[PDB]
């Protein structure tokens, strides 16, 4: 379905902004 | 015509637009309903990502229609 | 019978399997297509999820029908 698909796509999404965040991270301390 | 829009949440948001509105359009309309970003919502349409240059009738997107809503960080 | 898989960036691959083909041909088929690795591969058909121990007939997948290939990172 579309819900499910999309539902995959943002929790991917949201592990390659967690990734983000913890290159921030290293770039700060 | 009419299209509707359903969130990761189950929220489902019904807009009027036509064929010849873009997906950028689209995303105008959800920013009006809203208040998501254009650039922080992403649109699929029967499992395809759909493209901001492509319009709604490139897309085969009817009357009726459902698309799924991603809001972006 | 012919099917029809579509991914994000819009392309659509054709491909010939059978009804009693399970969905790890369709894995296999796909990886000898595009390269794109099985484990990273995830069809979906008719709202729900193909499973590898799953087969075409099964899903109630008939000729020409349209599925959504997501790719994983």
Do not use: C, W
């Amino acid at each position: 379905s579309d819900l499910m698909l999309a539902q995959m796509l943002q929790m991917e999404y949201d592990r390659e902004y967690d990734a983000q965040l913890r290159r921030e991270e290293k770039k700060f301390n | 015509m009419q299209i509707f829009v359903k969130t990761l949440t189950g929220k489902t948001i019904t807009l009027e637009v036509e064929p010849s509105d873009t997906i950028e359009n689209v995303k105008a309309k959800i920013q009006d309903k809203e208040g998501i970003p254009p650039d922080q919502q992403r649109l699929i349409f029967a499992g395809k990502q759909l493209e901001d240059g492509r319009t709604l009738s490139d897309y085969n997107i009817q009357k009726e229609s459902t698309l799924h809503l991603v809001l972006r960080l």
